[PDB]
Every structure is written in C-alpha cells, then in structure tokens.
C-alpha cells in the first residue's frame, strides 16, 4: 500500500525531558489540556494534590 | 606548473590555512572554539554527546 500521513503544525510550547545518555523519551505539549499547562508551569511530570 | 597569483579588486576568495593552537588542559585559560569565547579550565568527564 501507500500512505502519506502528512500533518500540519502550529507554534506551541513543549516541556522536554532530558534523560542521561542524550535522550528524551517523554514530552508534554502545553496546549491541549490545563493539566499539561500545569505540568509545564511547575516543570514536573508528577503533580501533587492542591 | 605555473601558479598565477592575483591581488585584484575582489574579496578574499582563496586564503592560507588556519593553524589551531594546542590543548592546554587542567588550567584556567582563555578558550575560543569557533566563536565560543571566555575563560575556563578544560577538563574531561564521563558525558555522552550526540
């Protein structure tokens, strides 16, 4: 078969995790849900209660 | 083999080689790694660059 699967992009902000040995393996886009924006605000992937 | 050297009104297209300095490590010295200026101690570590 044949599939292009082309998708556009928009300027947004991202919170990139920088693990050792030069890898990412996890990211969060702070434009989809308020939980992602909260994660990007305090710079943490595990948010406590409050 | 005749090498015709010219110095006409034109930008510097051909120049001589750019000899780099030695690597002075374990000493607070000035460093210039192609624009990166400043002063620091050149010491290795156990990081993994890409």
């Amino acid at each position: 078969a044949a599939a292009y699967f082309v998708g556009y992009l928009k300027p947004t902000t991202f919170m990139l995790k920088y693990d050792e040995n030069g890898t990412i393996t996890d990211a969060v886009d702070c434009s989809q849900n308020p939980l992602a924006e909260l994660k990007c605000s305090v710079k943490s992937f595990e948010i406590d209660k409050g | 083999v005749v090498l015709s050297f010219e110095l006409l009104n034109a930008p510097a297209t051909v120049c001589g080689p750019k000899l780099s300095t030695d690597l002075i490590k374990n000493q607070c010295v000035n460093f210039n790694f192609n624009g990166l200026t400043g002063t620091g101690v050149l010491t290795p570590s156990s990081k993994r660059f890409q």
Binding site: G7, L9, F14, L16, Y18, D19, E20, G22, I24, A27 | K47, F49, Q50
Partner: peptide
C-alpha cells in the same frame, strides 16, 4: 488522523543533563 504524542524532534544540538 491522530498524532498520539508523535512529532517530538530535537529543537537544537545542545546536550543537556537530567
């Protein structure tokens, strides 16, 4: 038609620690 956490590329060539 859904990019489930896809399209994350290195924005620069800078190595960063944890």
């Amino acid at each position: 038609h859904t990019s489930s956490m896809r399209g994350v590329y290195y924005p620069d060539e800078i190595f960063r620690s944890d």
